[PDB]
Ligand SMILES: Cc1cc2nc3c(=O)[nH]c(=O)nc-3n(C[C@H](O)[C@H](O)[C@H](O)COP(=O)(O)OP(=O)(O)OC[C@H]3O[C@@H](n4cnc5c(N)ncnc54)[C@H](O)[C@@H]3O)c2cc1C
């Protein structure tokens with residue numbers, strides 16, 4: 027296991043509650059990881075204020091609505107946490123992460139904010155970030171079966187890594203689709219990336235479903251929760267959904283609803299691979 031003291035290239039919001047942390051590896055080297063894998067970030071003792079975070083006005087609505095800038099996080103001893111690569115292995119020299127900020131639950135507002143994610147959200151371009159690894163178990167199976175990727179929230183990271191690894195490094199012709207659920211259009215990201223792959227690869231398609239599209243979205247795409255949209259628009263009519271491989275990563279409510287849906291279809295657990303962030 028190696029450690030790298032990386033430099034933060036950027037740490038921009040991609041969604042209301044998700045930042046994309048981009049890290050430059052020293053000397054241009056790469057972490058020798060597999061898609062679906064993860065690194066660990068370690069943080070020293072520190073103290074951060076949410077009021078100091080850089081959150082663009084476009085994403086600030088819920089932050090103001092719930093007074094999330096009230097929070098502070100004091101960490102007296104080093105801590106360490108896993109985060110999944112959003113880049114694939116031939117995106118060299120960098121580690122890209124998608125980090126959800128783990129705020130106090132709205133029903134429990136005076137408990138401490140999430141320690142490591144509040145630290146990551148405090149990082150700005152030029153800061154140093156120590157990572158170690160790589161690790162992993164959420165690896166793609168080596169078959170020719172159709173793949174169905176299902177993502178929500180920061181689960182975008184290992185899905186992006188997997189899908190790019192299949193199409194760019196493995197040059198796979200397997201049938202592949204990606205279904206991503208989000209609340210409204212501002213919560214979407216990597217749209218240029220996946221639109222690009224879908225235009226260039228006739229074996230790949232992707233869909234987004236919004237559960238609460240906003241008036242400003244002018245949304246005419248799928249609406250609702252992703253397990254309903256995947257079922258209604260693809261799996262219901264599928265001639266053999268039990269023969270696909272399902273790769274899923276999302277928030278806990280999404281994981282549970284998707285897995286329940288798949289099992290009611292008769293998919294067996296061997297064909298359902300969950301990357302559980304432990305929410
Ligand atoms: C293999 C792996 C890969 C992962 N990849 C990703 C990834 O790519 N992106 C990502 O976002 N996450 C990922 N995770 C999850 C991630 O490691 C952290 O668990 C996550 O960031 C939360 O950690 P934290 O330190 O911010 O929050 P913690 O300090 O662990 O707190 C978690 C939550 O509990 C609340 N809390 C604190 N004190 C109390 C109390 N007394 N009572 C009740 N509640 C309390 C906090 O407000 C917070 O919401 C991954 C996890 C694993 C295992």
Ligand SMILES: [Mg+2]
Pocket residue numbers: 040041211212213214215
């Ligand atoms: Mg966005």
Ligand code: NA
Pocket residue numbers: 223224225226227228229230231
């Ligand atoms: Na396509």
